Amino acid sequence: AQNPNCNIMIFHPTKEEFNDFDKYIAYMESQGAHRAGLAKIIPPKEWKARETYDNISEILIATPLQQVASGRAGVFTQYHKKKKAMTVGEYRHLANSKKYQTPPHQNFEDLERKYWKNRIYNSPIYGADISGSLFDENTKQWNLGHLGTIQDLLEKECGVVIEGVNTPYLYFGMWKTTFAWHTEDMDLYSINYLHLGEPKTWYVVPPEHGQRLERLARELFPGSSRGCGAFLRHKVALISPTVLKENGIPFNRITQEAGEFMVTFPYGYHAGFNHGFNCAEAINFATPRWIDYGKMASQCSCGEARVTFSMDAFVRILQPERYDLWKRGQD
Ligand SMILES: O=C(O)CNC(=O)C(=O)O
Ligand SMILES: [Mg+2]
Ligand code: NI
Numbered sequence: 001a002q003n004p005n006c007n008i009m010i011f012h013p014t015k016e017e018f019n020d021f022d023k024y025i026a027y028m029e030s031q032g033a034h035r036a037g038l039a040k041i042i043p044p045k046e047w048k049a050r051e052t053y054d055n056i057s058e059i060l061i062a063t064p065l066q067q068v069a070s071g072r073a074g075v076f077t078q079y080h081k082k083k084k085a086m087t088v089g090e091y092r093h094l095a096n097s098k099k100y101q102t103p104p105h106q107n108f109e110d111l112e113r114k115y116w117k118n119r120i121y122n123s124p125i126y127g128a129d130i131s132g133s134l135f136d137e138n139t140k141q142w143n144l145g146h147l148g149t150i151q152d153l154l155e156k157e158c159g160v161v162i163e164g165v166n167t168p169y170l171y172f173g174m175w176k177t178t179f180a181w182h183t184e185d186m187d188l189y190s191i192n193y194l195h196l197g198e199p200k201t202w203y204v205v206p207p208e209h210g211q212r213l214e215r216l217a218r219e220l221f222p223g224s225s226r227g228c229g230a231f232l233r234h235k236v237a238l239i240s241p242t243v244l245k246e247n248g249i250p251f252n253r254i255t256q257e258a259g260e261f262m263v264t265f266p267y268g269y270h271a272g273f274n275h276g277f278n279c280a281e282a283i284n285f286a287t288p289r290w291i292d293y294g295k296m297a298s299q300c301s302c303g304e305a306r307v308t309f310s311m312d313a314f315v316r317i318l319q320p321e322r323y324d325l326w327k328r329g330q331d
């Protein structure tokens, strides 16, 4: 069995290997990359996402989210308070202000220590989940707006035609902006490209050990667990690496820098934070290996998780028994 310790693998495809996206994902999995839940892909040196980032300041962040924490430094939840619209140029200036900027630090490790010590005492503003793309239309390789759609994969594998679309999303971050512990909708893959700015640190649990994380989360967030049988779908809970290590939960960490891709694999729980002002683009995707994970994915039916239009068909076809109750949650 390849990669039996479930380490995060880093790949360096040649420009020839960068042509066929599906084939490269299948190659990474042949080497055991999926066992980690997360892989890094460094693009060939000849590749570029677009020519420059000089003209992005007028993008609108319609609903910036202030991420307010509750709990203790290593075990907390966050809620998203909606703020007034602002442009990317206004958000960058905010991120660089004395109130919000990255503090002086020695290296990524020192910054990670400061994040876990002090995150809860601040409420950074995240420009998350903005439909759109920063890939130039002429970028032919690994262009996250030109991938094969999940609906087309389901049709090719299972023979059923369904409604729905699959488009990318932009994330504009600042110091301490945080993504809570989660797997993707319907335990899909994700791919994330860091277009510009400061790094993003990731934590991940191997898919084969995901239920260990869920059992810890039920212990640590006991009221939330009573409220919903899949409350990590709410995407609000954080647990630090120190707490994970104290509780014997297998995990790994890695920092993504500008110009690098990350792939998350089906049922790979992940969480993390931004180092300073940045912009990432991400989208969900599927492969034939996903289908069996989709069929078994947990679902929130309490009503909190509320998700896209296109998830309806995935539930309806892959999880017909759950459909009824899940749809109640969304309606
Ligand atoms: O970048 C972020 O804030 C969160 N991204 C993801 O969870 C992902 O790409 O799957
Ligand atoms: Mg612009
Ligand atoms: Ni994710």
Ligand SMILES: [Zn+2]
Binding pocket: 227, 228, 229, 230, 231, 233, 234, 300, 301, 302, 303, 304, 305
């Ligand atoms: Zn729920």
